[PDB]
Amino acid sequence: LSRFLGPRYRELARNWIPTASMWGAVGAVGLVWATDWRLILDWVPYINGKF
Amino acid sequence: MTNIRKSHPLMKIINNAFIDLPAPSNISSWWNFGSLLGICLILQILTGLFLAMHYTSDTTTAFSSVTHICRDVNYGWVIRYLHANGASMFFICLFIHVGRGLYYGSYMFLETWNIGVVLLFTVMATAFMGYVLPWGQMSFWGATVITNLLSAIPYIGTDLVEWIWGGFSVDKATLTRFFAFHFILPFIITALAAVHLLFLHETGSNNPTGISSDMDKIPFHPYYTIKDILGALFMMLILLILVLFSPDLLGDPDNYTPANPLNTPPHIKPEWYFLFAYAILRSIPNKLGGVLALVASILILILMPMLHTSKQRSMMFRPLSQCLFWMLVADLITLTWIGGQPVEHPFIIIGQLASILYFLIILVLMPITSIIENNLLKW
Amino acid sequence: MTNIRKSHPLMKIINNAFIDLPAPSNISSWWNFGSLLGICLILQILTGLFLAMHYTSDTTTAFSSVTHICRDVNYGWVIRYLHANGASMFFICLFIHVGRGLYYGSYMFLETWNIGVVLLFTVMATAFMGYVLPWGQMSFWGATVITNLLSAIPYIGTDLVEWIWGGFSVDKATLTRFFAFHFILPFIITALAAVHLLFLHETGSNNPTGISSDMDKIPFHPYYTIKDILGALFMMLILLILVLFSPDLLGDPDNYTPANPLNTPPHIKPEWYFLFAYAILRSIPNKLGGVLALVASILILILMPMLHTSKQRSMMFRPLSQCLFWMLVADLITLTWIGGQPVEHPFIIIGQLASILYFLIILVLMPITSIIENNLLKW
Amino acid sequence: GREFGHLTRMRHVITYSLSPFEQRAFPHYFTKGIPNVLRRTRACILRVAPPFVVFYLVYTWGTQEFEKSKRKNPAAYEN
Amino acid sequence: GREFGHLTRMRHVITYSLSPFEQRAFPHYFTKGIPNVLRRTRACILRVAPPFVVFYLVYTWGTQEFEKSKRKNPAAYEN
Amino acid sequence: AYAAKNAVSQFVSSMSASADVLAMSKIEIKLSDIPEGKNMAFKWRGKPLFVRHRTKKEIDQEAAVEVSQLRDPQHDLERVKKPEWVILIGVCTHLGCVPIANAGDFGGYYCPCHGSHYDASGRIRKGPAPLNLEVPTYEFTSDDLVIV
Amino acid sequence: APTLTARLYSLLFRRTSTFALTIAVGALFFERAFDQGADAIYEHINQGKLWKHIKHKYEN
Amino acid sequence: LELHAPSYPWSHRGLLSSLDHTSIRRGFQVYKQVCSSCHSMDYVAYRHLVGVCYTEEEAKALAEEVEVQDGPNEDGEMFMRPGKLSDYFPKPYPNPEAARAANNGALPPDLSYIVRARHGGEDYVFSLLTGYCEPPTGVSLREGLYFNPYFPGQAIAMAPPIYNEVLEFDDGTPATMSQVAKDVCTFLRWASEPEHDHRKRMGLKMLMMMGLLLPLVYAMKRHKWSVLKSRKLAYRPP
Amino acid sequence: EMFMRPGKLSDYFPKPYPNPEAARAANNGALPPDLSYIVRARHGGEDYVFSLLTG
Ligand code: HEC
Ligand code: HEM
Ligand code: HEM
Ligand code: HEM
Ligand code: HEM
Ligand code: FES
């Protein structure tokens, strides 16, 4: 994978890191909401009113 | 470089089937039901699977297992009544789809029409055995009557009936046979539906005008994906109404008593989607004649493409043919209503007349009327 | 005019799949097993279906129903032992197929190889759930151990294992869930096998030489249909030998006692086609480490294509790689034997060494040996 | 097979369109739909309704006749 | 895509065949088959067998060692 | 997303423990039905549950066990609430086999699958078992009744 | 003077990742609020009939 | 000829109306004190009352009030146990033949699904219980049969089970025949459909969600199809 | 009321005890195993049964 070791690829990673972080946040929020984890949802102000 | 959606094999199949498929732009809401059928099928599998995780096909535990599903399993009632009413929704969509095919001359797709007839028979068998599964009074006695119909076959009727029964009558053997067959058949239905779409995509879809629409084709995805999603949402609304406000509307109360081989229920009738055929079966006093009429009632769809005599494909431009079609639909409603009703003085004669009218309209009246329309149009 | 075989849609698919498919002229008998697998699958679908006509998935009627199949159902023992030994034949053919893929570099078909790995996982799950259906001592306790393995998953292990159990342990809920999943999964296996063949036919088939054989392609039908028929006949000979002369050769006798949750059998071990994995599972003292090693022992097939450091595809012209491959095969046999054996002084150390050798050969020794071979040929 | 590249030969047909974000989803929804719905209903009513009217008449007559048949006949008990 | 007619380019290769009804299905089955089998066996026996021979040795030792372990130890019961 | 989450959650929940299974989560054991020096096995949570009416001699010997000389340091007094009653889950810690009562060298339990030896308090004494038999949570509602 | 919808598009809907994050957060909060409101409506309609409305008379 | 039951204005016949759990409690008292002697509810357990009409301790007290046969003991013979909320409602008779022998050859049906097993449901049950009448002229009833116009055949083997002050309600409600019949029919409706209130709540939620979604998905479809529905096509031959 | 009848071919071989607890009580706490599959449920089969009986 040495082909992908270059300044252009580091620039690409810089460009797509915000998008990857946003998608990771989307995945985390979706997982917490779907599973009703309640380990994280206890901290959310209005949601923790439930249970 | 290339486009994955157009080059990858599975992506090629999916794109050519559901994404880039050229679709007529004028197809109405009556073309949604096809996709609806698929949805129903998928539902009838998913829901069905989650019923098999708790159902046990034993005469000593089948009814108790169903009560356990509807009493103890978390949201088991939701799943059970979704299954029960989804079968009725499946048959509603099937009837509407066959009506759409008859009206707009979609039967000219011979291979698609024949695979559809096979699908209809397979779905009817699956629903029959699935209804036998709960092992209530209605299930047991409807199975008894429907299977006993096969005894009318000459010289092999008794042997065939006792082979299907797995014994001398409907009993535990028959219940387990029906559970296995009911489990396995929907996957054969999915394979047949895949073949059905394969045959349909060979020539594209029809349209209300009955005229080739190659000059006006649109990508299937952006328009008909959302249109079919809206149709599925409406179907889900109707189904959820039936499952959350009248879960027992289309069922029969006598199926909530455990099967009693020594005591027939007050009335023995099948599920509503079979009643019309049942009605035809009761028109003929002869048992073999009744069975033959029942089979022909569905096999007439095979003859439908050959009976087409009009120069135009769709009925959109044939008012007399439209009147005949709506007479046929009202006749089918009459047959269903009578199949619900007992065998008494007015119902017998009305059912005989209705069956005669059904066969007359499909066989005699429609081709003659189409020829009359052709002569009126000077061709 | 045209040719119906080469024009009709379904006929087009069949002709391009099994009739006019260009196939290498030199593929040995090791290429039969693929078709054999399909045969086995179909058999398991047919035979199993006929077992589902008499089997009930209730703990109070599971073992009794199996004995009813074996004693009362006409030729029921034939079908039951056909199923039991056909699972073993399926796994023999699967292992030989994977060995053929490894030896002849068939994993260079990335999509085909990955679909094959998914198929292997699905078939293993299907067989594991099916072995629980008789509800014998071995079925219950092997299910107990294998499912309890899932409890080693951190955080969500207990909730996951209890969700799969349907309760607090293996009980009627688990039995019925497993029956439903066991019924449904082989159809998913058929769909995945169809996708597998779709991916394979995109690039044709490999040959023992490992060299592209487009110059020496022959029609598939007249040659490989009869060759696969002969292979299926030989496989059927072996399977019928197992069914009719040693039906209980590959099954532990302790599964013929009804499940006793309050008493463990003298020895607990899964079926032979899992023993090797079981062996690796017991090599790691840590529970989570053992489960991870078990999963990796089969996920390593995914890594296999990426570890191919040889300039030549097939091991036919790679004697050192052949030695390593046969060391791997002997190591797998050793792992199976150790998994059969109890956990005592010599068996623990031999199993640990065997697991280390398996992972070392697949991950370290094979690529280094391939590089050395490349150097020796001055590539 | 049948692909957008080659379905039919058409010449000298011009189609003008608008972006979905430049046009209203429901333009004149009621003021044009209601007359159009009325037109379609007027066109299709004479073709659709009469069979169902006949069915309803038959249904009512059959129900009435069955209910009358279930009723007692006085003439059977003259003596 | 993958059909007879465009798989590869081959030139100046002449192939001679025979009808299956003009030739014997088992030509020299044993006169030439048996020597050929021995050649194939000899070429592979030193690459396939040695790994399996090691397994047999390990299997025998493990079985013997397991037996010896279960055997009574006289020294343990001394005194 | 709301509708899909509700549907998927309902379908998943259908696969979890049913109402009756949860109803059978904790059981009632009448101590008067267990004679002295008898280890009774009950079907609890789908697994064997051992309730032994430990005798005075057995209580004394278990109280005399050297705590530090145990693979898992435990005390009989801290292992059980009532000295004369010991309640354990009949699942060996080694792999998960069912130990047999009064079979080991220590008079307690013996897992034959490999040979684990436990005392009358469930503490591992000999064999390959890494831990002691689990003690489920329980309380004595009355003199001769216990809920686990 | 951008409108509310223009602000929404510029901040959240323009980028698909932010669009999906907004959808997920909205799904969470909408589930909470909708469940609370629907439960309130249902309990008001059946006021005095549900067990939670009469349990106090039997709780200890 | 048969008589169809009237449509009584039950408090649960509303589109989103639930059951009166006080009526459910009174109907359960009626069941345990009147029809439990001959009728059975196999598919209803005491644990099913915990969240409906009795608290957990009250349900335990109800369960402990009736003895239940337990599994074999050490000697291998069955014994009796005070009972627990995991048990189902006791069977008045061991087998149906005993029930027929004790009720003049008529099997008292199981009441777990009775409202769901009879046409008319709770309406039919209420009309049957309160509909007992003196047989009209010309009706000759066999021995041990009673005239109920709503029962098919009008000759029912069940003697009128309820009457004024048949049982004394714990709630203090007057024990009129109509009140007892209404309460027991409400309880039997609960038994047939133990998910009645939850089903109504889910139906309300799904109605709200569909009313929210259908216009929205319709608007999405209109947004996508606006391109075609505004499309103007012109033909320009040379 | 339950009762006893002479018996017929359709009947299976009579059980010696009503329930396994009775068998254990009558056999010093040991349950006599069912012999319908005893040869097929034991390592050795008829060989094991014969050796056990005669040894
Ligand atoms: C005297 C014993 C007895 C009592 C007490 C009793 N039942 Fe019954 N019940 C019977 C018998 C016997 C039948 C069936 C008679 C027949 O089928 O001819 C029956 C039938 C019924 C039926 C109608 C079944 C049908 O097929 O139409 C209902 C409803 C019913 N019982 C409910 C109740 C309710 C509610 C109560 C409490 C008010 C009750 N029973 C009390 C003995 C009893
Ligand atoms: C086209 C597909 C199907 C149709 C039309 C269909 C139809 C039916 C019907 C009408 C019933 C009667 C339910 C009732 O009256 O309570 C039923 C029951 C049942 N079906 Fe199917 N079914 C289909 C697919 C499946 C599948 C795929 C499975 C399993 C994988 C399945 C499993 C069951 C079970 C277990 C029952 C009994 C449970 C119950 O009755 O509540 N069904 N089916
Ligand atoms: C499980 C059963 C069925 C499934 C899953 C199914 C599926 C579909 C689908 C998805 C379509 C495309 C959408 C459409 O054109 O409306 C379609 C079209 C069609 N189907 Fe079906 N169908 C089923 C039953 C039937 C039956 C019973 C018939 C006829 C008796 C039939 C005949 C046709 C025809 C002729 C078309 C083409 C319609 C046209 O192009 O105008 N199908 N089907
Ligand atoms: C790849 C496909 C399959 C595999 C590998 C497989 C494997 C197995 C195995 C190993 C058993 C244990 C038999 C024994 O221990 O005696 C079994 C039992 C069973 N299988 Fe299959 N099976 C397959 C497909 C099916 C299908 C498609 C069905 C039903 C349509 C089915 C129905 C059953 C039933 C009912 C049993 C229990 C009957 C008995 O144990 O004798 N199986 N299966
Ligand atoms: C139910 C399971 C499976 C079925 C039904 C199946 C079926 C087949 C068939 C019919 C072929 C073509 C005939 C042949 O090449 O011998 C094939 C080829 C192949 N299979 Fe599978 N297979 C299965 C599992 C697997 C597994 C577990 C793997 C690998 C881990 C795999 C990898 C491959 C590969 C690489 C080929 C192409 C080999 C070549 O062309 O030289 N398959 N399979
Ligand atoms: S499994 Fe219990 S000591 Fe080995």
UniProtKB/TrEMBL annotation, chains D, E:
Is NADP tagged as a keyword?
no
Residues crossing the lipid bilayer are 44-62
| Major subcellular site | mitochondrion
**A Pfam match:** UcrQ
Q: Which UniProt keywords apply?
A: Electron transport, Membrane, Mitochondrion, Mitochondrion inner membrane, Respiratory chain, Transmembrane, Transmembrane helix, Transport
Does this UniProt record's set of keywords contain Transmembrane?
yes
Q: Which residues form a coiled coil?
A: none
Listed GO biological process terms: cerebellar Purkinje cell layer development; hippocampus development; hypothalamus development; midbrain development; mitochondrial electron transport, ubiquinol to cytochrome c; pons development; pyramidal neuron development; subthalamus development
The protein's matches in InterPro entries, at most eight in alphabetical order, are given as: Cyt_bc1_su8, Cyt_bc1_su8_sf
**Which terms in the GO cellular component ontology are assigned?**
mitochondrial inner membrane; respiratory chain complex III
**UniProt topology in membrane:** Single-pass membrane protein
Q: Which domain of life is it from?
A: Eukaryota
Which Gene3D superfamilies does this chain map to?
A: Cytochrome b-c1 complex subunit 8
From the Swiss-Prot or TrEMBL record, state where the protein is found: Mitochondrion inner membrane
In the record, the note on similarity to other proteins reads: Belongs to the UQCRQ/QCR8 family.
How is this protein organized at the quaternary level?
A: Component of the ubiquinol-cytochrome c oxidoreductase (cytochrome b-c1 complex, complex III, CIII), a multisubunit enzyme composed of 11 subunits. The complex is composed of 3 respiratory subunits cytochrome b, cytochrome c1 and Rieske protein UQCRFS1, 2 core protein subunits UQCRC1/QCR1 and UQCRC2/QCR2, and 6 low-molecular weight protein subunits UQCRH/QCR6, UQCRB/QCR7, UQCRQ/QCR8, UQCR10/QCR9, UQCR11/QCR10 and subunit 9, the cleavage product of Rieske protein UQCRFS1.
Q: What is this protein called?
A: Cytochrome b-c1 complex subunit 8
Q: Which organism is it from?
A: Sus scrofa
TrEMBL record, chain F:
Q: Where does [2Fe-2S] cluster 1 bind?
A: 92
Amino acids binding [2Fe-2S] cluster 4: 114
- The entry's [2Fe-2S] cluster 6-binding residues are 114
Q: Which cysteines are joined by disulfide bonds?
A: 92-97, 92-111, 97-113, 111-113
Question: Which positions are annotated as binding [2Fe-2S] cluster 5?
Answer: 113, 118
Places the protein is found: Membrane
Residue ranges constituting the Rieske domain according to the UniProt record: 62-147
Query: Under what name is this protein listed?
Result: Ubiquinol-cytochrome c reductase, Rieske iron-sulfur polypeptide 1
TrEMBL record, chain G:
Q: Which GO terms describe its cellular component?
A: mitochondrial inner membrane; respiratory chain complex III
Q: Which UniProt keywords apply?
A: Electron transport, Membrane, Mitochondrion, Mitochondrion inner membrane, Respiratory chain, Transmembrane, Transmembrane helix, Transport
Topology within the bilayer? Single-pass membrane protein
Pfam families registered for this protein in UniProt? UCR_UQCRX_QCR9
- Subcellular localization, as worded in the UniProt entry: Mitochondrion inner membrane
**Presence of keyword Lyase:** no
Q: Quote the function comment for this protein.
A: Component of the ubiquinol-cytochrome c oxidoreductase, a multisubunit transmembrane complex that is part of the mitochondrial electron transport chain which drives oxidative phosphorylation. The complex plays an important role in the uptake of multiple carbon sources present in different host niches.
Family according to the record: Belongs to the UQCR10/QCR9 family.
Listed name of the protein: Complex III subunit 9
Biological source species: Sus scrofa
Gene field = UQCR10
UniProtKB/TrEMBL annotation, chain I:
Q: What is this protein called?
A: Cytochrome c1, heme protein, mitochondrial
Residues binding heme c 2 are 42, 48
* Residue sites binding heme c 7 per the record: 42, 48
Q: Which family does it belong to?
A: Belongs to the cytochrome c family.
Binding of heme c 4 occurs at: 48
Q: How does it assemble?
A: Component of the ubiquinol-cytochrome c oxidoreductase (cytochrome b-c1 complex, complex III, CIII), a multisubunit enzyme composed of 11 subunits. The complex is composed of 3 respiratory subunits cytochrome b, cytochrome c1 and Rieske protein UQCRFS1, 2 core protein subunits UQCRC1/QCR1 and UQCRC2/QCR2, and 6 low-molecular weight protein subunits UQCRH/QCR6, UQCRB/QCR7, UQCRQ/QCR8, UQCR10/QCR9, UQCR11/QCR10 and subunit 9, the cleavage product of Rieske protein UQCRFS1.
Q: Where is the signal peptide?
A: none
Q: Which residues bind heme c 1?
A: 42
Query: Where does this protein reside within or beyond the cell?
Result: Mitochondrion inner membrane
- Superkingdom is Eukaryota
Q: Where does heme c 6 bind?
A: 42, 48
